[PDB]
């Protein structure tokens, strides 16, 4: 069991205690997906006002 | 001196960080109008408390946060509270209308509207930055803003900071307090959206915090200020070492590079002891064996697993109070034989420790007793995995009749994002599987 | 009244046992899926162990203990057995024994000993099996070790090898092998209790050591006795001998009782096997208890030593003692936790 | 600050929601001029979400009155607290609809449906954040039934992203008064299938019996009747009222009960120790519905109690019902049953429970209604009171095709497994 890289200060102290050793989308794309699913909602409401207008 | 925000999003989010905040003042002497008489210096200073503090030339400490939910009822309680001085209202933001525990409703239709504003808000805080380290988002998986808006400012965040680090405090769900029977959906759809923005998240089951509380502070019927009170203490002892002079876990990069040696499974798992009850007048001060094998208990874990199932990959110990070295490798030794705790073949067996000599704070009045010792073990182990089964279960008897599907439908979203999301978590928990079992 | 459900219809045990919970009436059953439940008889493989204990007002308990796996599976326990100090790669009562993979492994190391011995003109007569294979089949006995490596690399599932117990004790009449099958019941506490009553699975055809292209008189399964052989059934009912009976024969044959020479190895190694896992799949002190019901199988040799042969997490009675048992895990594994309204039949082994 | 618009229509509608009124201005310490008189604060937190706040700190309800005759309108402006509501919301025609579903949706209704719209819109022009509509009205009559959906399907075209909620009192099966019920409400159904987000079914042989058989009013009145309803009003809107998380506003409580569009008809509930309650509020003879809860599964449930009590003793009881009768609860909506608390107990009682249940047996009342109409279509009885009106027949054949859809989705998902 080593006991290395002890640092030690005044509020406290730090060490590693070893037992073993071993053997992003762009801006533009979120502003199309997010536009996307904004149309999704319109086609929604038109549909529907269509419905009542009928 | 580098700098930290945090941003706290949604119900839970808000009031989680309403408690550490209120427990990182007490732990600093910091008093509700600002004012700390233990600072020196005055309108500035590069200390190690500097990097969650921003100071201003009357000598007030204004906490680096930012707190958004998109309904005015919690965030109102900051402006009116106890520590409504502490901080100045560009960094509370609200809406009017909250996304009604739907994720697509907080992510597509109300995030759009106010992320800008949002993002304005936590670029005022970093132009008062000269090197910023990244950011903590506090925040729930089953409500609508906390996963909505969230998984949609962590995307934005990897681009307006690209190279800055996010650490996530998510609330897994939990029936005994949700709120909502869609949780499971939302869980599994943020995860997937957050998952390669998040460098490290640490969960908490409110099952487990909430068990805590009954067992060890014989609480009939735990509420949110027991479970904050609670999760704040945990949060206080992971971000000290951001907080006070150390050599451990002083940057946001080393959360990543002590726990994380594999991307997607950075989801460590907490365990905190002791938790005494300070209606038990005295009790016999427990020894720092005694706390450290608590720490190998699930009686004690942020989310009831089993560890003796799985792997760990990176374990950390973090005390505080009376601890030396010498007493901390002769619990490990000895817990190291009674204890059945395997590592992966390809990381070496060891920990990571780290020890403050102040003794955990406790809020007055609050339901936790005063101890001399504490310590919290952050280890990624894939017993956590058994997390996301129980979560994806449900998600797939929801999914298998659509229920519920056409509120996130009717918001935007495609059925598309469900499979999508759902898959994902399948290849999580087969990645936990790769390494964790034989 | 409790509930509980069951996932593994072909468990002949587990079905008298639900039988016995409804003639209760104080036990409904529920459906497959249905997570309200205070008892699961669960499935054999894959069994979600991760999503019991978090049902809120729900006492759950379950028929397998996690982890036990290790301990069931040929591979797995030749590794426990080498590697653990509890029981020592100079372990007594465990054959010699080698884990071999088709195509870590430790074919190398069985060479060495297979002709370390053959330089003393010892038996070199080794066996290789695996959890693969049934039915009779997926068996191999020979003196020569080329026969059976090459019969391995023949195969795609890992096997182990193992010294075959070349002076096996004899039934006579007969001149018959046999093993012993004992049932051991673990509940929640982790007490380890041990049937009284065990069986020898019984060899109907004289055991011949001189060819073993011959299966029959050297498998003792209840199977390869009732399908290759005629004599099946002369001396005893189904190849089944109970231990009345032979603490008799050994009285009359041997001046000894079933009790001293044999039955307090077995006693050793079951605690042995069980003690040494504890640590890695006890529920004292989990949100979710369990219980198993295991059956031993060991082999008994002229100089009436016991060894063990393998281990069964899911195993299967005789006709015979159905009734007696499964009512035994209802009263020590299940009415313990969940109690009813209003002598034993097991050996508890202490530690 | 989240506020809900209140429309009351026809004789049944009126009565109720008058009693609703009376119920709850009590609860909020609000006196008949409109001046608060109460103890606690709580009472005010969230009193604008039902009632609008008018110059001098009095308190006018958000409530609009409609009915095509005037008798029922006079009545209620000479009732306890008829002084209350603000004079311009009685919206009333003359003819009345005379149990014309056509004539309160297309011909009579068609005349005074602007004007009501008129006050709709001011009210919703008031509001901080408008929240959606809540309706009381019969479906067997012709102006809460006919014209009552007129307003719901006018009313979705100006506010398609706001919720609407209704209380209906349905047909009953063994009790009428009106011949043509069968007509007027498969007529009125197929509009609520389509244009509400949650209804309330109520029939009136269930309260019959409550007031009958446990309450024991020797002689029940519609008055009596009403004060049931009305009590149970409160009880499903004190989550709406008091502060709180669990379903506090109409959209989360719709996601939290509505699994599938079309399956939002709920079967409310009260009652009258705390293992008292729970047991009440579960059993048939509590339910304001004529269906049997013990034929069906409960797809989603809500409950709520209020006053002072033990929630470790409330939610160790509610758990018990769950896992004792786990065979009446879907296995596939894990954790359905949501239980909520509010320390304001109702008047008179110290301790109360509401029920509210989305049960697959409500198909039964739809089953009913389904077979009366036919009986009468195909020999097309009474039917030309309708087509003199200016309907077709095929308005009729859609209607109950509707339904008879309906009735086949509730046994699809009562039968559905995991
Ligand atoms: C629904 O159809 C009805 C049919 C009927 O007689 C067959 C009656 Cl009496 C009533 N009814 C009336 C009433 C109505 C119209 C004309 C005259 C009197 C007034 C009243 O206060 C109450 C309580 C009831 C009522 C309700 C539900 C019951 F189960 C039993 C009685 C209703
Ligand atoms: N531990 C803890 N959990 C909370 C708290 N508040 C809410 N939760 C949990 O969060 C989930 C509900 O999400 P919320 O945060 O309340 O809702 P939200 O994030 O504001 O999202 P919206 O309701 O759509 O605005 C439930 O699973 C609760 O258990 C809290 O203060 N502490
Ligand atoms: N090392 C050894 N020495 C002598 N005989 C052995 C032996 N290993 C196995 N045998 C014989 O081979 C037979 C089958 O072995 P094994 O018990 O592995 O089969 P199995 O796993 O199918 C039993 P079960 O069906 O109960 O699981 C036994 O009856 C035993 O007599
Ligand atoms: N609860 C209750 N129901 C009523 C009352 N008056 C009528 N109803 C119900 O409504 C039906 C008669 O419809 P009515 O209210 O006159 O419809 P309208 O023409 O729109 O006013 C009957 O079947 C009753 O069940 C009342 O005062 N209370
Ligand atoms: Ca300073
Ligand atoms: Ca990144
Ligand atoms: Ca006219
Ligand atoms: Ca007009
Ligand atoms: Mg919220
Ligand atoms: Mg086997």
Same mark, same amino acid.
């Given at each position: 069991m080593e006991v290395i890289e002890l640092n030690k200060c005044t509020s406290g102290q730090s060490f590693e205690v070893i037992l073993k050793p071993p053997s992003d989308?762009?801006?533009?794309?979120?502003?199309?997906?997010?536009?996307?699913?904004?149309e999704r909602r319109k086609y929604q409401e038109a549909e529907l006002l269509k419905h009542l207008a009928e | 001196m580098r700098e930290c925000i945090s941003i706290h999003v949604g119900q839970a989010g808000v009031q989680i960080?309403?408690?550490?905040?209120?427990?990182?003042?007490?732990?600093?002497?910091?008093?509700?109008?600002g004012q700390m008489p233990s600072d020196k210096t005055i309108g500035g200073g590069d200390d190690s408390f500097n990097t969650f503090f921003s100071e201003t030339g009357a000598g007030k400490h204004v906490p680096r946060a930012v707190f958004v939910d998109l309904e005015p009822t919690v965030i109102d309680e900051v402006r009116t509270g106890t520590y409504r001085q502490l901080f100045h209202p560009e960094q509370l933001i609200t809406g009017k209308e909250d996304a009604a525990n739907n994720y697509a409703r907080g992510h597509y239709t109300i995030g759009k509207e106010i992320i800008d504003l949002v993002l304005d808000r936590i670029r005022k805080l970093a132009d008062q930055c000269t090197g910023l380290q990244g950011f903590l988002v506090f925040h729930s998986f089953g409500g609508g803003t906390g996963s909505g808006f969230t998984s949609?400012?962590?995307?934005?965040?990897?681009?307006?900071?690209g190279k800055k680090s996010k650490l996530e405090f998510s609330i897994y769900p939990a029936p005994q307090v949700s709120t909502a029977v869609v949780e499971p959906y939302n869980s599994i759809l943020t995860t997937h959206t957050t998952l390669e923005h998040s460098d490290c998240a640490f969960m908490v089951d409110n099952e487990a915090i909430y068990d805590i509380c009954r067992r060890n502070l014989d609480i009939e019927r735990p509420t949110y200020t027991n479970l904050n009170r609670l999760i704040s203490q945990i949060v206080s002892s992971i971000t000290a070492s951001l907080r006070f002079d150390g050599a451990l876990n002083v940057d946001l990069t080393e959360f990543q590079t002590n726990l994380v040696p594999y991307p997607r499974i950075h989801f460590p798992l907490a365990t905190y002891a002791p938790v005494i009850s300070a209606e038990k007048a005295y009790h016999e001060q427990l020894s720092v064996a005694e706390i450290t094998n608590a720490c190998f208990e699930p009686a004690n874990q942020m989310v009831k697993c089993d560890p003796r199932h799985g792997k760990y990959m990176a374990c950390c110990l973090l005390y505080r109070g009376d601890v030396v070295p010498k007493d901390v490798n002769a619990a490990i030794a000895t817990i190291k034989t009674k204890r059945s705790i395997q590592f992966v073949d390809w990381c070496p067996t060891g920990f990571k420790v780290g020890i403050n000599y102040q003794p955990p704070t406790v809020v007055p009045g609050g339901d936790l007793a005063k101890v001399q010792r504490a310590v919290c073990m952050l280890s990624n182990t894939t017993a956590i995995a058994e997390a996301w089964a129980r979560l994806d279960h449900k998600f797939d008897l929801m999914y298998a009749k659509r229920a519920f599907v056409h509120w996130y439908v009717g918001e935007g979203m495609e059925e598309g994002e469900?499979?999508?999301?759902?898959?994902?978590?399948?290849?999580?928990?087969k990645d936990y599987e790769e390494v964790g079992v034989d | 009244m409790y509930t509980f459900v069951v996932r593994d219809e072909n468990s002949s045990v587990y079905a008298e046992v639900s039988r016995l919970l409804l003639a209760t009436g104080q036990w409904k059953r529920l459906r497959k899926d249905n997570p309200r439940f205070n008892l699961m008889l669960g499935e054999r493989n894959r069994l979600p162990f991760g999503r019991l204990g978090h049902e809120p007002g729900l006492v759950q308990l379950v028929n397998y203990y996690r982890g036990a796996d290790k301990l069931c599976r040929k591979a797995s326990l030749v590794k426990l057995i080498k590697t653990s100090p509890e029981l020592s790669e100079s372990c007594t009562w465990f054959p010699e024994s080698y884990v071999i993979y088709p195509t870590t492994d430790e074919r190398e190391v069985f060479l060495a000993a297979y002709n370390r011995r053959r330089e003393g003109r010892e038996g070199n007569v080794w066996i290789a099996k695996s959890s693969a294979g049934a039915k009779g089949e997926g068996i191999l006995?020979?003196?020569?070790?080329?026969?059976?490596?090459? /019969?391995?690399?023949?195969?795609?599932?890992?096997?182990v090898i193992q010294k075959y117990?070349?002076?096996?004790?004899?039934?006579?009449?007969?001149?018959?092998?046999?093993?012993?099958?004992?049932?051991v019941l673990v509940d929640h506490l982790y007490n380890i209790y041990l049937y009284r009553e065990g069986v020898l699975r019984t060899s109907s055809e004289p055991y011949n050591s001189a060819n073993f292209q011959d299966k029959t008189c050297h498998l003792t399964n209840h199977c390869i006795?009732?399908?290759?052989?005629?004599?099946?059934?002369?001396?005893?009912?189904?190849?089944?001998? /109970?231990?009345?009976?032979?603490?008799?024969?050994?009285?009359?044959?041997?001046?000894?009782?079933?009790?001293?020479?044999?039955?307090?190895?077995?006693?050793?190694?079951?605690?042995?096997?069980?003690?040494?896992?504890?640590?890695?799949?006890?529920?004292?002190?989990?949100?979710?208890?369990? /219980?198993?019901?295991?059956? /031993?199988?060991?082999?008994?040799?002229?100089?009436?030593?016991?060894?063990?042969?393998?281990?069964?997490?899911?195993?299967a009675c005789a006709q015979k003692l159905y009734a007696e048992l499964c009512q035994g895990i209802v009263d020590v594994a299940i009415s313990s936790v969940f109690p009813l309204a209003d002598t034993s039949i097991f050996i508890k082994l202490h530690h | 600050m989240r506020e809900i618009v209140h429309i009351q229509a026809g004789q049944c509608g009126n009565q109720i929601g008058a009693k609703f009124w009376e119920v709850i201005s009590d609860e909020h310490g609000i006196d008949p001029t409109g001046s608060y008189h109460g103890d606690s604060d709580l009472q005010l937190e969230r009193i604008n979400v039902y009632y609008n706040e008018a110059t001098g700190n009095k308190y006018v309800p958000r409530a609009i009155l409609v009915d095509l005759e005037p008798g029922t309108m006079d009545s209620v402006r000479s009732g306890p607290f008829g002084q209350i509501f603000r004079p311009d919301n009685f919206v009333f025609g003359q003819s009345g609809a005379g149990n014309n579903w056509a004539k309160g949706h297309y011909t009579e209704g068609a005349e005074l449906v602007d004007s009501v719209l008129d006050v709709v819109r001011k009210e919703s022009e008031s509001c901080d954040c408008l929240q959606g509509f809540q309706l009381t009205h019969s479906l067997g009559g012709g102006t809460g039934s006919g014209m009552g959906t007129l307003?719901?399907?006018?009313?979705?075209?100006?506010?398609?992203?706001?919720?609407?909620?209704?209380?209906?009192?349905?047909?009953?099966?063994?009790?009428?008064?009106?011949?043509?019920?069968?007509?007027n409400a498969t007529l009125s159904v197929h509009q609520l299938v389509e244009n509400t987000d949650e209804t309330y079914c109520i029939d009136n042989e269930a309260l019959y019996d409550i007031c009958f058989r446990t309450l024991k009013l020797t002689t029940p009145t519609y008055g009596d009747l009403n004060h049931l309803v009305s009590a149970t009003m409160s009880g499903v809107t004190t989550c709406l009222r008091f502060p709180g998380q669990l379903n506090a506003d109409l959209r989360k409580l719709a996601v939290n009960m509505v699994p599938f569009p079309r399956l939002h008809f709920f079967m409310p509930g009260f009652a009258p120790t705390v293992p008292e309650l729970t047991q009440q509020m579960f059993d048939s003879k509590n339910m304001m519905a004529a269906c049997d809860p013990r034929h069906g599964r409960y797809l989603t449930v809500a409950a709520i109690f209020r006053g002072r009590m033990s929630m470790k003793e409330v939610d160790e009881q509610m758990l018990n019902v769950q896992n004792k009768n786990s065979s009446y609860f879907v296995e596939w909506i894990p954790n359905n049953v949501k239980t909520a608390v509010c320390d304001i107990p109702p008047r008179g009682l110290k301790m109360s429970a509401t029920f509210i249940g989305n049960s697959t047996a409500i198909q039964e009342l739809f089953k009913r209604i389904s077979e009366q109409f036919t009986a009468m279509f195909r020999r097309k009885a009474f039917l030309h009171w309708y087509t003199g009106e200016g309907m077709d027949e095929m308005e009729f054949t859609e209607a109950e095709s509707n339904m008879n859809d309906l009735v086949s989705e509730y046994q699809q998902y009562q039968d559905a497994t995991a």
């Open positions: 989308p762009s801006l533009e794309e979120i502003q199309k997906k997010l536009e996307a699913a904004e | 960080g309403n408690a550490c905040w209120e427990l990182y003042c007490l732990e600093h002497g910091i008093q509700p109008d949609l400012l962590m995307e934005r965040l990897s681009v307006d900071y469900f499979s999508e999301a759902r898959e994902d978590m399948a290849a999580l928990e | 006995i020979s003196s020569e070790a080329s026969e059976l490596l090459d /019969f391995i690399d023949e195969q795609g599932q890992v096997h117990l070349e002076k096996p004790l004899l039934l006579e009449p007969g001149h018959r092998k046999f093993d012993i099958r004992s049932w006795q009732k399908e290759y052989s005629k004599n099946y059934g002369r001396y005893e009912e189904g190849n089944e001998m /109970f231990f009345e009976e032979f603490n008799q024969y050994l009285m009359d044959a041997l001046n000894t009782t079933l009790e001293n020479s044999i039955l307090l190895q077995i006693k050793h190694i079951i605690r042995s096997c069980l003690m040494c896992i504890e640590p890695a799949i006890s529920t004292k002190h989990l949100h979710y208890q369990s /219980f198993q019901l295991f059956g /031993f199988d060991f082999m008994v040799d002229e100089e009436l030593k016991v060894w063990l042969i393998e281990v069964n997490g899911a195993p | 307003l719901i399907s006018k009313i979705r075209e100006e506010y398609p992203d706001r919720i609407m909620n209704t209380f209906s009192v349905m047909p009953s099966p063994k009790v009428s008064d009106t011949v043509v019920e069968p007509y």
